[PDB]
Structure formats: structure tokens, C-alpha cells
Write a protein that binds this ligand. Structure first.
Ligand SMILES: O=c1cnn([C@@H]2O[C@H](COP(=O)(O)O)[C@@H](O)[C@H]2O)c(=O)[nH]1
Ligand SMILES: O=c1cnn([C@@H]2O[C@H](COP(=O)(O)O)[C@@H](O)[C@H]2O)c(=O)[nH]1
Lengths: 212, 212
């Protein structure tokens, strides 16, 4: 992705979301849109962003349901225009395979979330993360999400998935993660608040890029 | 699209196609892949390009069949990962609507080809082109293709579709069209041979961009 930087656009109002995204567009080419924006403004916001900014859109939906429901969620998400969707691996292989089947049908991609970046991720997710990553490899997953806040875990995850897999990483900035250290292991970093809550989002994005 | 320039990648061998596309990637972000490459190397080449270069892919398939067959062609094309497909308008509204229905189902886009750029287009297509463009407007089409070789026709087509519609234009270079004149009316130009048959494709792309 452009400058190895993905904007997590979690503002809830369409006007502010469009303003900030347009201001930092020259520094990115990929935007992660999640439920904070979609549940407030509707799924049509995905196609609007894709058209207006010509950026790739990752739907950050943390899909975590049974196979049947996961299939419906992925179908609606790709119908809305998303290029990829993030799915949790903790609910198991069948739930991930359901997402992979819809992505195959629709010519889209699935990103498998292994370990999360927040403190609570240490409680249960961390202990299952290496196995979730290996499950991904077994299922043919080529895109993964891992934590900026724990570079030693990001290193181990990179070890499991290999150098050819694409790995993106949130938790940079607000959560404590460092851009440069994270990029020693991840292909791209996801940044939300450090950019969208800044007084000057473009200057904030430019600063991150210059730091790396 | 980047630099308002779309590469028409009509080389037939995968190695040469990948070489040239990689060499000019910094000047573009959108590649038109058609049957010369797909029929020689397979539909999987679309996903390969999309992944390797991170570019948007327009399938230049000139869809021109009955509704039922058009639906199947569009479904296979979007399943293969194409972001958009070019469809002929001369076979009529039902044939175009079939493509629009699949694009809606799959969160993709249809480009309507109005008038073609080659000499033979004057025989039958030109006389129907204004009506084909109006049909597009009536059907809700927002993306169009018009001829670089006839800027007065491109102007009339732009008049019919409005300023908000996206218009791309082939026939630049080899066929005689001029980049700058074409861009007075079209949003982007499509260039094939002037770039891919050049001794230095990157220098050729750079020259076109500098000329505009
Ligand atoms: O382990 C994970 C997975 N996903 N995200 C998501 O990535 C973004 C990070 O935003 P931030 O830069 O504002 O912390 C948000 O959309 C958040 O839901 C995390 O923060 N951590
Ligand atoms: O009216 C049209 C529609 N499509 N194309 C396509 O656009 C590309 C133009 O290539 P060129 O720059 O080598 O002439 C080729 O893929 C060709 O099939 C035209 O040339 N003219």
C-alpha cells in the first residue's frame, strides 16, 4: 500500500470522515472502514469512498460468527464494494473457510486476524494466536493482521506465515505501537486516531511517513 | 487514475506483460487487460496483476452478447478479480442491463463503450453512438469509453453524459489520437502500443505524462 500506511477511518460522521480522508489521500491508497463509520452512515459509504478517493477498502469487521452467518456478512460486504474483509480466527477453521469461500466466489480477499493489539488480547487470544496463524497457513490464507504493540509477537507471527504473506498491523500511535519497529515485521501499518484526531491529519500522516 | 493514464496491456506472453507493467507502474495505477492477454495466459492473470502491482484492473472485453451470456461473462470476470468491465452498447439496453445487474450484485463497475476509435467505427457505430450514450444515461451508467481519434465526437459524448460521469478514451498514440487534446474531454486516456512496444516503456509513459 502507498507509503506502507493504511488509514483506519473510525470517525462516525460522513462529513468529517470524507474531510480527513481527502486531506491525507496523497499519503495513502488504502483505507480500513469499520463498524464505527458503517453503523452510523450505512454500507453505501464503502462505494462512496472507493469512488471518490480511488482507494482500496478493507472492511474491518472482525467477523466472528458461525459459518452460515459469516458467509452472509462477507457476501453483503463484498456486494458493497469492499476489496477485503478482516475475519477473526479464534472462532475456528470452519468459520474462516466460510469467509474464504465467499471471497473466492467474488474475487476478493480475506485478512485473518491472529493476535489483537489491546491489553485484553493477552487474556485468551495471545495463547491461541500462533495456532490461529498456523490454521491460516493450512487454509491457504495469504493476508494477516498482527499487533504493533508487541513486536516480538509480530516477529513470531511473521515466522509462521512466511515472507510471502502480507501482514498488516494496528496499534500504532494511540495504542503505543511504533511505526518503524512495526514495519521491521509487518508490510503495512494501520493508523487511526494519531491521524484522524490530529489538529492537522495531513501533517500527522506526513510525520509518520517521514519517521519511516 | 494516476496521471490520468491507463495502460492497455495487450502483450500476449505473461513474462513480457509483467515486465512492461512493472516498469511503468510508477506512472499508472490502472491497467486494462483484454482478450489478447487473457486468452493466451488465462483469467488468473487478472488476480496476479492486481496483487503484484496493486493496480485496479479494467477487463477490456467488449461484451457484446445476449443478456444471458453477458451475465455469465460478467460473473466470471468479476469472480476473477476485475474491478470493472467494458461492455458494448450497440447490442441494446437489455444486454447492457444484464451487465449492470451483475456489477451491482458483485460491487463492481461497468464501462459503456459508445463510439470506437478505429476507422471502421464510422460505418455503423458512429451513427448510433449518441443514442448509445443517452441509453447509458437512462440506465444509470456512470462510466463511458469514447474515441481519442475524434475529439469532436468525444466532446459531443461528454455533452450527453455530463461532467460527473467518468470517461476514458483509447486510440492515443498508435491510432493517431493526441493525449492533451483527448484529455480536454476525457478523464483518462488509454494507451497500449505507444508504451508496450516502445524500446523504453517507462520513458514512453513518462513522455506522455510530461506532454500533459
Ligand atoms: O488488534 C487489533 C485489530 N484491529 N484494530 C483496529 O485498528 C484500528 C486502530 O485504530 P487506532 O490507530 O486509532 O488505535 C481500529 O479501527 C481498531 O478497531 C486494533 O486497534 N487492534
Ligand atoms: O474504440 C476502442 C475501444 N477499445 N480499444 C482498445 O484499447 C486499446 C488501445 O490500444 P493501442 O493504444 O495500442 O491502440 C486496445 O486494447 C484496444 O482493443 C481501442 O483501441 N478502441
Amino acid at each position: 500500500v502507498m507509503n506502507r500506511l493504511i488509514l483506519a477511518m473510525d470517525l462516525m460522521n460522513r462529513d468529517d470522515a470524507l474531510r480527513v480522508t481527502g486531506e491525507v489521500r496523497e499519503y495513502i491508497d488504502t483505507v480500513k472502514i469499520g463498524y464505527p463509520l458503517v453503523l452510523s452512515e450505512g454500507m453505501d459509504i464503502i462505494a462512496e469512498f472507493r469512488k471518490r478517493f480511488g482507494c482500496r477498502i478493507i472492511a474491518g469487521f472482525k467477523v466472528a460468527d458461525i459459518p452460515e452467518t459469516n458467509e452472509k456478512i462477507c457476501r453483503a460486504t463484498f456486494k458493497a464494494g469492499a476489496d477485503a474483509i478482516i475475519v477473526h480466527g479464534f472462532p475456528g477453521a470452519d468459520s474462516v473457510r466460510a469467509c474464504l469461500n465467499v471471497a473466492e466466489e467474488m474475487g476478493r480477499e480475506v485478512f485473518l486476524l491472529t493476535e489483537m493489539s489491546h491489553p485484553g488480547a493477552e487474556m485468551f487470544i495471545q495463547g491461541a494466536a500462533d495456532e490461529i496463524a498456523r490454521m491460516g497457513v493450512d487454509l491457504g490464507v495469504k493476508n494477516y493482521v498482527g499487533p504493533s504493540t508487541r513486536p516480538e509477537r509480530l516477529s513470531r507471527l511473521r515466522e509462521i506465515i512466511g515472507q510471502d504473506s502480507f501482514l498488516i498491523s494496528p496499534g500504532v500511535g494511540a495504542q503505543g505501537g511504533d511505526p518503524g519497529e512495526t514495519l521491521r515485521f509487518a508490510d503495512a501499518i494501520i493508523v487511526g486516531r494519531s491521524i484522524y484526531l490530529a489538529d492537522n491529519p495531513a501533517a500527522a500522516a506526513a510525520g509518520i511517513i517521514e519517521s519511516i
